[PDB]
């Protein structure tokens, strides 16, 4: 019995590979998939934030649908407080990225001033009028419901369906007025305040980047966020728009478009081209397009992204039962294993961490599942298919990367060390999917934060001054990477490690490779 | 834009196949994966049972952990009442199978006579003693908990964990007495009566087939059940034991072993050999072995079964949020799409149908998802890999099957018609995974019921007397199969269909194949 | 140790397949590659022609570069005399096809009336003038050489090379006159009369179909030849030209274009489209294009033809040492094994049979080598790659063919029986490369003759009148095919055989398949 699934690793066919999966083949200590946690009331604590960092949280996400800039700054503050409390031991310091998840063309319900009403239980077949007249803006109730979108009457047909509270509630547009819609409760259930509304099949003319958006992003640049999760991207221009607002001072903030509608699925290719990565926002996507179709959209996007060399994040409701329960469902565990198996660079925790009872437990589960699915991949077939996808390129770093990843497969390297500052080089190695961790040593801080988007990169910040002699400088960083790998238990003295570094100070890319045993 | 995913179907690599998945490529009307519904309070109604039949329920499952034989007979009665209400139109009649899901070596909690107590909320760190002394057998409470397993003290070590209510509650065995265990509530939560207990790492000496079991099975033979879902199979003998109880009168009842422990995973191969099919019982398996490992065990078993030609059923918590909600989670939709993609012959609904609010909705969802994942399979690669798995056999029906399935791929047949009585022949075609439905015309009733275990078979019962002339008899059945395919909308006049039939009355197997247009 | 190379047959990789080739794995009695013999002085004898027929000669070729129509008619006469001497036993009768190999835009040397001269040995560096002045038309000698091509001076540049006697002699065009060329003997050697001249890089404006050609072809239609080997095809029009001369009475004569220049390699695709098959005429091709390139041109053409479903014949100098020796060279044996391995439908014997000392020995060698290389093919990989080449077609006979060929692979059929009259159906089976022989039973005579062009078809002529009952008629032919297979030793009672036949009298194609044991 081999370890880390090396037996299934040797199969000639995918079916053989599946038949050979062993639940007694222990994975390796390293976990390559990045976990992104949505920060909320259940996790804003610096204390809980340290526990989350120690549990593998990599990127802290900030949903700007909710909260005041003041509330967010203090979140960024705490997040930074906890990340830096470990800054003391550079060998045990883990940079955590910060992500601004934008509030998109979001339509939401008004306020239910019907406060006497314990639960505004809506019942099947009942009627409910929807008003744009903002006098009931706060007097929402089972009978009259107010909403954001002022051009909704122009967009909907008598007969359309309206989805509130994550499509849980469906309304049939029975009658249409000049500024209201007489609907019928198709799906009864209790509705709350400010719930989100989805108009599948409707042409929402709302803009990608609104005034609110322009302010949240500008606060984003100011608070020096690493990446931006932009909601509702329908086209490549939306991305150029988001980009223009960030300007020069936002020149390095990575824009991750969120495909959560049909248009973005249609226009996917153009979007991917223009973005820095992609997010499969299962939530709205699954209300915008038929829920049965979602898995198709997900695999197409992860495969395409994997093909192009762009990070891709699978999101929403992955371990959701864990908001109230300490263990996920059987369906939830497979959902996570299959996203890693699908090739997702990062997986995400939202309600599970934002306001759930089991923040940390959720984190460790994604960690556990991620570690195991990563071992269950069919690297050989995957790399061949990936090598072939790229056929048209003659790129040198891609060559160093393929070559390095190929060498690691043969000698079963414990990891790959990449000395990088801009991050491009480590990115390329991560793209050809090695089985071993990629320790990325850099003195650039944004680089180390943002390297979390990529599968396999374990970023490490070198806090030592630069050495006069390039070689000394190189070995300085290589020992840093070694002492870390050994402290983290990724490898021990005597193990073999592939090392990618530049020949001379101005090498352009990682053009030298060595196969060295761990000292 | 092709339909039914024919574009992705043409890919040279699995990555290409993934990149080509289109959410605008409508599947076909036929759904090949069999849906198994667990019958409970929410579905015992003949009226709801007709609605469930019209919604695609194929096999009714009866969990013998609960209920009285009297309660079950009436369930079998109603199930039969509803199936036969359609018996009138043989073209629209759908045989529904009945499955006896055995109560295995099940350990359960006592009764909580602590009735004054609204909710016996157990809290973290608290202590709780577990007694075998059956005086508290009904006086269960937060302080004293009684259980089934009388040899539990011999099996556990001080330090072990005990899982109650589907592992939701974990107890640390702090102290051990001669007939009790002083445990500590590791996971606080409200515990109910008769909950199930799991002892991971413990050697439960309970038997596979108990006295209760011997009676439930004998009632099973008597009520003429089609298959048996046997719980907790640890080895090939357990299966021979279950088999021996069924005897000669149970000679045709299909025994499906349920792998829900570690031993059955270990001994899997021996079990598969001895069973008629397998069930991946995610529930207990996920409490018996680390939940992170489960997806491994599932894929290994589905691949291995797919390899051998044995039906395999993926089960438990597939659309569970739908017990209280009308729409599943994003994680649940992928769980179902991935089991079909994994190759599962049948998928199952338990709490979702047994006592859930949305019985029918759950059914149609599995139906929807199943239909779409079936189109997203990589048939070409799958068939090649399957053809290769079989390499060692020179079997003639396997040859007719491979040949037929290959021909269907080329001409894009609307379906495959198989005239079978024993079912063996249609089974072989289903094993090489054609893309088109397999209409199985038979005059045998158990055959048509039990053909649900196999992916792709749409069983049809011929209610006409036998014709003196074999040819006439053959064409009689072939038109039956055609009128059905047309009524169900699987194909229309002019479409092409592959037809497998016997040359002469005593052919042994389906040895003649024709490519005929639909009249 | 398996037989017929079944072990290598099971390999997962081509390298594995090669490593597994066993010289102790006896092939099967049947040989599928068709042997084409060029008839000459050494084989015009009816007696030698029977021996050649008994030795596997399949198609008799008639090179119209040489001979008088009177000489050819008597050859056709003898060929027919010998074929029909076996006509007595229909079970042992073998139809032999007749092929008219056209004299193309052929340039040839004049007559050497320098008869006193024992051998007109030309020596290096010497000079030699080439005259169009036909007074020396017969007075050819080492000093003055006359030739056919009257527009040669317009075509050549001072500096060009002229190739005489199959490029064995090379001349450098040192000086150019108005109607002569002062050349220099680059390659000295003895030159004979009427030798052929090749002008590589020259634009020969000679026509594809000349007056001579128009007469030879019209004699071809008249003598009722089966196929036509048309020399020097440069384009698709040349083929339409050859076709137009055959007219309606030549409507069934198969036109096989001979690619023996660079243009035909360039225009290959257009030619293939327009022809009935192709011939890789290595002789001139190897003087027209650099000899090192030839193997490239050959494999490209055989692969492309194999891809399209068109017969392809590898020709010239395959066993040439056997003109004077009784055993071929080591290089010659591999040349033949590699053409079969390459996928060549037919292989050819020219000088080896035309005027060689060992006519019969040459035949049996091609037979021996062919039989063994056919076993060394990688059918599995070949069929998959072939199935994929065809992807775009949904053709029903192609489906029956793929399906049949797939079934034969699984059950290891001893042969495939195809009841055909027009031959189309058997052709399709042969195209997906089964491992077993394809016995083609037909009552059509041209069909049975011309079925030799295709790899695997063992044509059989049914000489029985038609039966009133289609079924009886079908079984009549199937037993014919069985008694033949048994007489030829291809299979014995108890062996399995795939049988392709039409359902009813007017089936359109072979749409019914059965797997039957040999009676």
From Swiss-Prot, chains A, B, C:
The modification N6-succinyllysine is found at residues 54, 154, 310, 486. There is a cross-link at residues 103, 254, 258 (Glycyl lysine isopeptide (Lys-Gly) (interchain with G-Cter in SUMO2)). The modification Phosphotyrosine is found at residues 93, 136, 163. The record marks 258 as: Transition state stabilizer. Beta-D-fructose 1,6-bisphosphate binds at residues 420-425, 470, 477, 504-509. Substrate binds at residues 61, 258, 283-284, 316. Its cofactor is Mg(2+); K(+). InterPro entries: Pyr_Knase, Pyrv/PenolPyrv_kinase-like_dom, Pyrv_kinase-like_dom_sf, Pyrv_Knase-like_insert_dom_sf, Pyrv_Knase_AS, Pyrv_Knase_brl, Pyrv_Knase_C, Pyrv_Knase_C_sf. Mg(2+) binds at residues 260, 284. The modification N6-acetyllysine is found at residues 50, 77, 154, 254, 258, 293, 310, 463. Residues 295-519 are annotated as: Interaction with POU5F1. GO terms for biological process: cellular response to insulin stimulus; glycolytic process; positive regulation of cytoplasmic translation; positive regulation of sprouting angiogenesis. The modification Phosphoserine is found at residues 25, 85, 88, 115. Its EC number is 2.7.1.40, 2.7.11.1, 2.7.10.2. The modification Phosphothreonine is found at residues 29, 183. ATP binds at residues 63-66, 108, 195. Keywords: Acetylation, Allosteric enzyme, ATP-binding, Cytoplasm, Glycolysis, Isopeptide bond, Kinase, Magnesium, Metal-binding, Methylation, Nucleotide-binding, Nucleus, Phosphoprotein, Potassium, Pyruvate, S-nitrosylation, Transferase, Translation regulation, Ubl conjugation. There is a cross-link at residue 154 (Glycyl lysine isopeptide (Lys-Gly) (interchain with G-Cter in SUMO1)). One of its GO terms (cellular component) is rough endoplasmic reticulum. ISGylated. Under hypoxia, hydroxylated by EGLN3. It is an enzyme of class 2 (transferase). Pathway: Carbohydrate degradation; glycolysis; pyruvate from D-glyceraldehyde 3-phosphate: step 5/5. L-serine binds at residues 58, 94, 452. Belongs to the pyruvate kinase family. This is Pyruvate kinase PKM. It comes from Felis catus. The lineage of its organism: Eukaryota, Metazoa, Chordata, Craniata, Vertebrata.
